Amino acid sequence: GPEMVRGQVFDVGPRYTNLSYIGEGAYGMVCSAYDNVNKVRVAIKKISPFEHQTYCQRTLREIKILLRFRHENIIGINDIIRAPTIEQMKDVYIVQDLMETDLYKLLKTQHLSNDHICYFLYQILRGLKYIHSANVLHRDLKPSNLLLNTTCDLKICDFGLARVADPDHDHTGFLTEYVATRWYRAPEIMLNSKGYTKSIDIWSVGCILAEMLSNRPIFPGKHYLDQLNHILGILGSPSQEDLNCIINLKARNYLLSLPHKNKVPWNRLFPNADSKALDLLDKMLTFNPHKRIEVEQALAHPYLEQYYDPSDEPIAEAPFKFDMELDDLPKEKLKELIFEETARFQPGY
Numbered sequence: 550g551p552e553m554v555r556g557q558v559f560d561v562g563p564r565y566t567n568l569s570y571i572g573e574g575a576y577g578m579v580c581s582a583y584d585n586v587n588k589v590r591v592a593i594k595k596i597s598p599f600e601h602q603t604y605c606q607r608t609l610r611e612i613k614i615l616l617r618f619r620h621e622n623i624i625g626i627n628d629i630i631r632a633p634t635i636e637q638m639k640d641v642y643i644v645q646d647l648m649e650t651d652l653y654k655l656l657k658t659q660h661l662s663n664d665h666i667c668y669f670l671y672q673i674l675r676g677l678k679y680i681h682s683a684n685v686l687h688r689d690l691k692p693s694n695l696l697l698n699t700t701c702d703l704k705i706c707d708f709g710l711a712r713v714a715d716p717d718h719d720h721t722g723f724l725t726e727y728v729a730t731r732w733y734r735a736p737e738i739m740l741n742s743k744g745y746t747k748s749i750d751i752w753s754v755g756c757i758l759a760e761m762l763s764n765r766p767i768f769p770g771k772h773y774l775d776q777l778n779h780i781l782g783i784l785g786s787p788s789q790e791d792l793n794c795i796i797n798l799k800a801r802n803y804l805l806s807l808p809h810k811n812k813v814p815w816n817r818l819f820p821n822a823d824s825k826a827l828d829l830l831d832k833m834l835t836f837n838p839h840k841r842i843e844v845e846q847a848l849a850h851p852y853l854e855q856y857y858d859p860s861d862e863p864i865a866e867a868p869f870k871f872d873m874e875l876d877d878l879p880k881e882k883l884k885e886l887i888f889e890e891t892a893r894f895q896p897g898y
């Protein structure tokens with residue numbers, strides 16, 4: 550029989566064996582395994598999306614995007630397993646090289662040296678530079694999606710929430726609401742919920758930096774609307790100028806009705822942190838998304854000057870365009886597209 554992990558069948562034999570639980574989500578589970586053919590340890594992400602259009606969209610995007618990415622700081626896809634015919638396909642298994650841990654687990658057991666924080670942050674932004682150069686938004690950057698080895702190599706994973714946004718088109722009003730994980734959500738995800746940009750990823754990285762500095766989430770909102778109150782509790786109330794940049798009248802009136810909060814100085818929250826790290830943190834956690842530092846400027850910041858080197862920081866040679874966005878289709882058509890995108894890993898073809 551096929552191996553089972555916590556009640557989930559993993560139909561990945563005979564090539565992949567010795568499965569161990571790593572984690573799970575609403576419609577998927579990840580296990581470690583052994584690749585008997587290449588004699589290497591792998592992670593396998595089982596995805597079962599086909600009953601819901603949104604799940605199918607996210608499965609197709611993760612596959613299409615990662616199959617076209619090749620970058621040292623981004624998890625690669627080794628192999629994709631699914632049934633030989635579309636009717637039998639209920640699950641898709643994405644196979645990746647196995648990393649030792651993630652940043653979420655590391656921060657449970659270790660206080661990081663400034664050198665480790667600096668080097669980890671560089672690698673995050675080095676991978677993000679490549680992602681953003683491809684016109685992709687990751688939209689769910691957080692410690693558990695940053696994979697780590699003992700060599701301190703870092704790789705970004707889980708592109709289930711990622712998508713392409715062709716800059717030739719205005720995506721205002723067409724972007725999915727309620728993206729990112731709550732504590733890592735930029736304010737405009739709540740105040741401009743269908744019209745944010747790739748700068749929400751920079752905000753997430755800022756939340757990650759703060760978490761590396763103190764081993765605690767900086768904005769641990771208890772529910773969706775509580776999240777904005779945590780953000781404003783530290784940044785203080787938005788300036789008049791920043792307010793009048795919120796185009797949504799409803800969101801702008803909601804903000805005008807909040808009680809005034811003063812800014813908490815960064816070095817009061819992080820009194821032992823590198824002042825350069827706090828300066829970069831401040832620019833990444835900037836309320837106004839258009840004033841927020843962009844990925845290349847973040848790499849060029851004094852905090853990262855031991856590592857910044859554009860001659861060794863690849864960008865995408867064919868940035869993605871609208872063709873990568875054609876997924877507002879019935880889930881039955883998306884299943885056909887997923888079948889086609891994964892056909893290159895099938896015997897025959």
Ligand SMILES: Clc1ncccc1Cc1nnc2cc(-c3ccnc(NC4CCOCC4)n3)ccn12
Nearest residue numbers: 572573574577578579592647648649650651706707
């Ligand atoms: Cl968990 C989950 N479940 C359902 C949906 C989404 C997700 C999140 C998610 N997506 N892709 C992935 C990939 C991986 C992965 C890839 C390579 N090496 C390792 N090594 C582990 C070993 C134990 O320590 C943590 C690192 N993990 C992890 C989570 N991943």
